């Protein structure tokens, strides 16, 4: 009774963006809801789902008091640049995890600083099957991954764990009860991608643009926010604003 996260942009009536939390003040009408927007008229869930079937519509959400600092996952083109900005400019606000690997420790490496080294590939496989990792992968036949416990340690000491992970990790963290701020940075156009990345050609930028549209579709239920902008500085402001807003002690979580 009744707050929902909108999973689409709506341009009518109450405008809203993918990620916005709406207070639905009246849902009696099958086609149209009245809604408030926890910073008008909006399509009902069934109406929007009919339009899209012709599916991301609304997700019910609720308040939670948490007792840890939320991990941060930035997705989309520009994520590497923004993650770099955050951890470098704000080292006292963000922490990173130390990943695990089965690759052998090399001469100048330090366990617990470079990696948590795992002596047996079979043991790391068991741990992955036992859901001890939020993300794992292979390189040169060795396994690598970011553990639930490493993220929990950062969250519990009071820093935001900046995670370079894919969208499938968001779900894993929700299950672990370490709800992340998950922000997708959505490009406006291929032109915009080129504007803010004068490195790429208009074939590379097009592929990047394409990949982002698909990512938003695939993981659109899991984002807690979506940001857009015409400059990197506008984007970066909006990301910091979103991190602040979604920091709690009080936060919105799926119902």
């Amino acid at each position: 009774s009744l707050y929902v996260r909108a999973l689409f942009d709506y341009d009518p009536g109450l405008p809203f963006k993918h990620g916005d939390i709406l207070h639905v003040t009246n849902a009696s009408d099958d086609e149209w809801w009245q809604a408030r927007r926890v910073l008008g008229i909006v399509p009902s869930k069934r109406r929007w789902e009919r339009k899209m079937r012709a599916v991301l519509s609304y997700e019910a959400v609720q308040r939670l008091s948490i007792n840890y600092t939320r991990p941060v996952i930035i997705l989309g083109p520009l994520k590497d640049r923004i993650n770099d900005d955050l951890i470098s400019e704000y080292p006292d606000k963000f922490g990173s995890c130390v990943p695990h690997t089965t690759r052998p420790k090399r001469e100048y490496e330090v366990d617990g600083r470079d990696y948590h080294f795992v002596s047996s590939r079979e043991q790391m496989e068991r741990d992955i099957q036992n859901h001890l990792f939020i993300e794992a992968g292979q390189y040169n036949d060795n396994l690598y991954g970011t553990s639930v416990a490493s993220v929990r340690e950062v969250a519990e000491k009071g820093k935001h764990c900046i995670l370079d992970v894919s969208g499938n990790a968001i779900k894993r963290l929700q299950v672990a009860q370490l709800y992340p701020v998950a922000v997708f940075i959505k490009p406006k156009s291929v032109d915009s991608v080129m504007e803010m990345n004068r490195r790429m050609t208009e074939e590379q930028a097009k592929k990047t643009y394409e990949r982002a549209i698909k990512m938003e579709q695939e993981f659109g239920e899991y984002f807690t926010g979506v940001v857009q902008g015409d400059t990197i500085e506008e984007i970066y402001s909006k990301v910091k604003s979103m991190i602040w807003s979604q920091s709690g002690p009080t936060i919105w979580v799926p119902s």
């Binding site: 390189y139 040169n140 499938n168």
Partner: peptide
Amino acid sequence: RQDMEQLDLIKITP
């Protein structure tokens, strides 16, 4: 970490 930039991700069941 160079190696982490080069991963083929494995799906975590379920």
